[PDB]
Amino acid sequence: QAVAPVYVGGFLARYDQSPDEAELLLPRDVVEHWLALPLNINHDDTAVVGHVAAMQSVRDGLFCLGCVTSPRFLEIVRRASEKSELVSRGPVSPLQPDKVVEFLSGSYAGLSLASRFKHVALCSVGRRRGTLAVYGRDPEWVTQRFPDLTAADRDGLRAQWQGDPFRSDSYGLLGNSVDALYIRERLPKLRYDKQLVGVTERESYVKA
Amino acid sequence: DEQQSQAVAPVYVGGFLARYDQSPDEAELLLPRDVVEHWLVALPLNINHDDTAVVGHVAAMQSVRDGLFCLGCVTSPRFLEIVRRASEKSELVSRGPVSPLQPDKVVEFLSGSYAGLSLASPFKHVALCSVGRRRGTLAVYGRDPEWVTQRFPDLTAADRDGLRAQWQRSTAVDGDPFRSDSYGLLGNSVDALYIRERLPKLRYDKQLVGVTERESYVKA
Fold this sequence. Notes:
Oligomer: homodimer
Shape of chain A: globular
Organism (chain A): Human cytomegalovirus (strain AD169) (HHV-5)
Subunit structure (chain A): Exists in a monomer-dimer equilibrium with the dimer being the active species.
Subcellular location (chain A): Host nucleus
Protein name (chain A): Assemblin
CATH class of chain A: Alpha Beta
Catalytic activity (chain A): Cleaves -Ala-|-Ser- and -Ala-|-Ala- bonds in the scaffold protein
């Protein structure tokens, strides 16, 4: 079923990266000290789509695994996915087509941690670099998309992930999508994030 | 309801569909002046060439010194309502237009989403898209047809008279010609996020037609 659960994984912060703003800084020690969070869209608290199923502080940073479960949001996404050229082109060679997963990959390619832990936002592109969002139906498959993770890192994550809270609508998502078009260097940042975490379009649903 | 009424009033869109001064790399985009004049029942106005997404009609078309210029009119109640609700949830629109211009959520959202124009095919119709394949095809939105044409420096008073004579003239297009929904526009919006060099092309188009100067609702 298309409207079945969707897992999203990726880094909320890369220690090896120097944030441009003194606000984005997120040291390891301060993170390992703090280390279920709601998962939303673009930080709008009226757009909760699921929850964070796991968080693990690793070598290169803070890795996060989330699960999109809102029936209202998955249905809106399903409908929109049927009317999208990007999605009709499908994924790369081996990967089987998954409209909902592909629409989510194209739309919210970034991950953003809110704590200006309050919650993780799915967004057009994260403000911190290396925050690529990877979507999939199977949590194991998702975590295996990141080379930086070790079997030990994955075991810590597996133990964790192992009414409808979305109070928004298609109109809200649409207005948000137009904003996405004016975020400068969006794609370059995404490509940079992709390169940094070693994820490739030739082995995932990443559109960037 | 009264303000929401004004927001869903008709919106005019104007711009070049082709520029005689621009040589396209792809032969399929060739549209020389002579062919345009010979070729030149209102044509429908749709979103990215989708027949289920007709939002209005072309009010006028005219070949001028610099290219093929057209004036369209967005009339679809259902389409305008979708745009209205979405525009209320846009940070882009919330920032607003440049100073003297009155804020206009619907016009600004359209300016942001469908910044380009695209001719279809002798003339089948005109489509609103995020960015056109032909350079110089920037879309300019406004509530007044006259104001819209006054946005283009290349147009002379004589050019505007000819255009005016056309749009001042009920079409076999406009109940509601829109046969899609917010989901369809959402599906289309994600596609727009991966068009290469979207903004650069838009800015190139903006400078080409001189709209850069003339204050307008253009977001690029």
